[PDB]
Write a protein that binds this ligand. Sequence first.
Ligand SMILES: [Cu+]
Ligand SMILES: [Cu+]
Ligand SMILES: [Zn+2]
Ligand SMILES: [Zn+2]
Lengths: 146, 149
Amino acid sequence: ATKAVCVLKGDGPVQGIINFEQNGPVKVWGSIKGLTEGLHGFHVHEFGDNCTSAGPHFNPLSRKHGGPKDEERHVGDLRNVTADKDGVADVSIEDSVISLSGDHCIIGRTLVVHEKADDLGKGGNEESTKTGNAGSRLACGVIGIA
Amino acid sequence: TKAVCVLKGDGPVQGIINFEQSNGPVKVWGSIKGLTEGLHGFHVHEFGDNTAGCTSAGPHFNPLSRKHGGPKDEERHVGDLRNVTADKDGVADVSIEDSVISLSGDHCIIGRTLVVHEKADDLGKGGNEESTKTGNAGSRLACGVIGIA
Ligand SMILES: [Cu+]
Ligand SMILES: [Cu+]
Ligand SMILES: [Zn+2]
Ligand SMILES: [Zn+2]
């Protein structure tokens, strides 16, 4: 019955709040503003160092980057969030790999939203297997106990 | 094990505090700028929730359900650190060691908020009710969620 929250901010105008609630799936929802219309990579990264210092995608099992439904993905690979014309992304997803307890606990890690869409590891180049070619980290926030 | 916290607020106050640690002491160090010269309250609060700025961080981390006190007092909250000291330039270079907090286990502070205050923490030695709760440290000038490093 644990809950977590992350406030996203960056150098640009992007800002948002993302909630987390949980061996059960983790429900993830909230809103992000200041985004350009389009799909945006959304991942939990390794270090809760507020966005270049966040490190790579949270990868405790040392796996290759993938999409949320792939058996091969980083624990932090959540999905692309969608921002409408008004630059707002309403987030509402359920993820089975992250957790707020145990080996895949994300409390104290960073949540990062990217400039471009995540190719989910299916891009055909090496970078795809690492970051999904999602581009700059527009905003991030440390995941905290709510 | 190592943790880091980036402190930010509505104003000039910003800093970075590192934590480095079993039951061994936790070394806390870093610097905070933009502070008025003098003492400023410094505690780990219960929640790592910054949705309302520092206001939503909750009270001081107090897993053992005790009254507020100074860091070296018998009775204190786990999150009660000593006041930080800002110099003439408004800079507080912090270097503290605490054996009550922890980066692992129960009194783990990762995921919680570090907060720096407007006034000095009176260590619970004040002449009122609130002293036993907040040390009368006043408003929260900056804060940040303690993250894994
Ligand atoms: Cu990312
Ligand atoms: Cu405080
Ligand atoms: Zn990834
Ligand atoms: Zn206290």
